[PDB]
Amino acid sequence: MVEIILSHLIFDQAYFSKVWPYMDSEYFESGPAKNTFKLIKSHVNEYHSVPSINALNVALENSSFTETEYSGVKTLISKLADSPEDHSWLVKETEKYVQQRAMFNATSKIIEIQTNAELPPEKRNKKMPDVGAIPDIMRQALSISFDSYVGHDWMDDYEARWLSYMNKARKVPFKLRILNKITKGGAETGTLNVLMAGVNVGKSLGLCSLAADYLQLGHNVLYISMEMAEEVCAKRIDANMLDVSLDDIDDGHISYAEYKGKMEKWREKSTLGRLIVKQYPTGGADANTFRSLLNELKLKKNFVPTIIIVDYLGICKSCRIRVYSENSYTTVKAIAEELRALAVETETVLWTAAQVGKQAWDSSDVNMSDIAESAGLPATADFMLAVIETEELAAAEQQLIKQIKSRYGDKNKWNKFLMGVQKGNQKWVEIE
Amino acid sequence: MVEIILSHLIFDQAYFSKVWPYMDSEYFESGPAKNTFKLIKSHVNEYHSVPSINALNVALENSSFTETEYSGVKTLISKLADSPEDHSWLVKETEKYVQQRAMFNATSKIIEIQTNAELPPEKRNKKMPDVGAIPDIMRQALSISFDSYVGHDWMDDYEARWLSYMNKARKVPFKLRILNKITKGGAETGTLNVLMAGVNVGKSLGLCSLAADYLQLGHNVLYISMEMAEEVCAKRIDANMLDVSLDDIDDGHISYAEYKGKMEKWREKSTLGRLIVKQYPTGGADANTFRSLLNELKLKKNFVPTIIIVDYLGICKSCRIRVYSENSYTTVKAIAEELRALAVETETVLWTAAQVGKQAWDSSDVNMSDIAESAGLPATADFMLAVIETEELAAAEQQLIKQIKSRYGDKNKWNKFLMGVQKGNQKWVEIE
Amino acid sequence: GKMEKWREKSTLGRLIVKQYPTGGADANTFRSLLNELKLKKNFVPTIIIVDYLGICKSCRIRVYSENSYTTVKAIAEELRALAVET
Amino acid sequence: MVEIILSHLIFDQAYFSKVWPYMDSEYFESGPAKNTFKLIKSHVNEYHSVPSINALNVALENSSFTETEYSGVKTLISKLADSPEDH
DNA sequence: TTTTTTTTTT
Ligand SMILES: Nc1ncnc2c1ncn2[C@@H]1O[C@H](COP(=O)(O)OP(=O)(O)OP(O)(O)=S)[C@@H](O)[C@H]1O
Ligand SMILES: Nc1ncnc2c1ncn2[C@@H]1O[C@H](COP(=O)(O)OP(=O)(O)OP(O)(O)=S)[C@@H](O)[C@H]1O
Ligand SMILES: [Mg+2]
Ligand SMILES: [Mg+2]
């Protein structure tokens, strides 16, 4: 049914718009269909417009086809006449035909490779790849996109925009009321959020608390620890969930009976996600390793996270440059860009913590210029919180959170607010 | 690798238990391998235990097939030896072989289906799958892999994590009341512990004292001196262990009789550990050099250290920054990260020392900002003790210790505590 | 009601919003996007607005063959060349 | 004496202890010996242990090698055996 | 070899 495909490519515009990128010369035939599709594709890539019948004829005249190909293309172009068909049905049939033809090409290549490899080494040909590259061509036949989004037309796509507005398909709510009220319903899907604070003042504590809350809200959470082992972060999360004090696990003040009892009482709830903690060596993992980790989790453990928390994002590799090849600014900006690209690609909320230069350690006020590792991070950041803590504030068992950078709302409404962080329990609560 | 797989299935149990389920009768061959695996699977089904060579022989005897196949399988069970290869390599190569054989079977089925399709409809078998069934089997070719430990799940790994809780895994006691009290059972294997003090305050004294304390408690210590020679470090260890003042060691007050007697007395103590001292030129020690000499000499001296000490962290050499760099911050941070990574890879407590800034030499208190030569070190350090010295405390033979940073406990609970120092004895004592 | 009221106006143009991965887009990628908007739709922009220039990737430098003042300036020159060309 | 060197690398543990870290790929020849030591290097860098004969000629030795050099490599692997003498 | 950057220290 290639003739219908070509006729609707030429005479229809919505049809051409819907499925251009999945049209390839290897999908029709070795005869007139491929030739006329080559004509169409040449005109398209040359003039950036759907050719008309006159344009196709003109391209035919100044071509290098023999008599047989000329006659076939001329007849096929003559047959091209517009007909009324269902748009969705046409799209579905195009998907079916493209899938079937890709599978046919794949299996033909498989036959060729297997048959030639069966031959003795002298009889076989080196022009054709060995059996080793069977799976890739086997998996490329199943990796056809079939969906292409060119842009968000402001006037033509206001229905979907309003559906996203009312449905809040982007916001991911917190468990703290103050965070929701300052972020207008939580953090969005493809975003990078930052906790800015000094050394040993509650960065990883805050990230573990956020991970615990997300896990409580039925979310698949992937905690990527860079400074402490898997058991340490899992112990912090255990202290947060089971309400066991962190000192108690060390001192053995909790019996295995009660620990297992509350573990069971947590595991029975259906409002509980899956948490996978994956520590990497300090400065030894990159965004490509993160993507491979996601792929392996999905394939083996059937795990696709919705929240990915990376504690101390700074100690990574940019995956584009050699490690320590550049200065701190360049490599950190590249790592942050890769992290936000991963967040937008997987539509996963990405939380992290930022180091602060010595000029703001033990200081009651923290600004965005006080960030240490780079200035390419705050530009790439969608939300930053200062987690300041002075001696007096630490005495009162609280931290001063400052909204130094907010893209979800105005950062001058509730700029200062106190948070009741419980240092022992690795969890913070709202003062209200 | 049919022979290896069959052998380690018959003999090994860890290999058998790790991957029994990912084994199909059609993975092996059309000849003797399939028959032997059929016999193994039949024996496992009849009796839920791994068979033995005699069991395979008798099962072959009571089996019935062609005499040529009988001889082939009998010869096949004549070569299955123990051959204890590595288990990780075993499972990895078995996974590779299984994936290759699954790919071969899928390819063969695809060829058969395509050949059946390219036939007149009269001469076709309806039992054969249609062309449309080809894609899904391709997924069955790609969706084959052994389950592997990807991350640390917080729920379905809680029992092992509790095992790591009740067992004080990754803990090394200190033989000192305040140290074990503040670290909640010693430092953890694969961490960074640092002493920050001014110039000539007792950093090397402290490291030697810790090395001796570990040596008493049956610990192997890899001392790496960057400033002092091996003889000097051995002398400091002697002064700490034998309670001989540094004056008496080089003034001749120590006699060979007493020295020999005390040495043999410590030799008879089976609780005594093993200590070595490797010296490197100032700024000429590398992480790769750490592993090399230990690797070959580990075979040569059967010595593996629980505690690795690197004197004067600030004057080491990086294994990633190839050329010398004037930037203190980047180089020192990279060196600290390299040290922490080496410690975690070897799973051994790493101790070091650090230099305070020029402004902290005359100060009675030391802050974390007053560190020198970098700010990446306080970020990479799991534990930091400031050895504060002042004239009044020096007169009282006491040095203040202030836990600047602690990931083992709360650094505000016992932040400041006096520790008695015997500089002549080069020893640490706890004030009661 | 407001959307349809704006659509009723004959003085209203067209707005196309396209998001690119941070670092993934390029001046040649921008040109390909313009060609795609001319092909798929009848859209030929008169105003092009980019949130930030330096995020993009140079079409001539491979990845980071040189420093910041060889890629950022190259992208700026490529974007001005795009403006002149279109 | 590359054959003796590789034989004692594979079979003698004490020899591997004092001689392997000072060994390199380009220290034997450009023929089969280089390929054999490359296989050994890959195995040791992948598992931190000396490969067995089976781990060498079965798991490896099935890489992208031409027949002329693959035959030589398998011949070299065949002629490997321990030699009793002092370390 | 020009640049841009974060940084420690006189
Ligand atoms: N194991 C622990 N037991 C008890 N309290 C702890 C423990 N670890 C940390 N704390 C407390 O939590 C505070 C912050 O700890 P962290 O979670 O490491 O915050 P941090 O800022 O990420 O630390 P770094 O190493 O600078 S990133 C410390 O100052 C202690 O008061
Ligand atoms: N051989 C020695 N004899 C007597 N006292 C010594 C000796 N070595 C060090 N000390 C004393 O021990 C204290 C500092 O010793 P060390 O630990 O060697 O110095 P440090 O902490 O390593 O600082 P550095 O490395 O010299 S900048 C001072 O009070 C010295 O007087
Ligand atoms: Mg922390
Ligand atoms: Mg000293």
Numbering used by the authors:
A (entry chain D), B (entry chain C): 1 to 432
C (entry chain E): 261 to 346
D (entry chain B): 1 to 87
Mind quoting what the paper says about this structure?
From step 2, we derived two 3D maps of the gp41 helicase hexamer bound to the ssDNA template. One map (map 2-I at 3.5 Å resolution) showed the ssDNA template in the helicase central channel, but the helicase hexamer remained in the right-handed open spiral form. The second state of primosome assembly is represented by map 2-I at 3.5 Å resolution and map 3-I at 2.9 Å, each with the ssDNA template bound in the central channel but with the gp41 helicase remaining an open spiral. Initial binding of the ssDNA caused only minor changes to the open spiral structure making it slightly more compact with a narrower gap and less mobility in subunits A and F. These minimal conformational changes indicate that the DNA-free gp41 helicase is competent for loading onto ssDNA, although a gp59 helicase loader protein is necessary for efficient helicase loading in vivo. In the open spiral gp41 helicase, the ssDNA binds to five (subunits B-F) of the six helicase subunits and coils inside the right-handed C-tier spiral, as compared to the activated helicase ring in which the sixth subunit (subunit A) now joins the other five subunits to coordinate the ssDNA phosphate backbone. Therefore, the 10 nt of the ssDNA stabilized in the inactive open spiral is increased to a total of 12 nt stabilized in the active closed ring gp41 helicase. Interestingly, ssDNA binding in the helicase central channel does not immediately induce gate closure, suggesting that the ssDNA-bound open spiral is a metastable state and that there is an energy barrier between the open spiral and the gate-closed, active ring configuration. Therefore, the gp41 helicase in the active closed-ring form, but not the inactive open-spiral form, can recruit a primase.
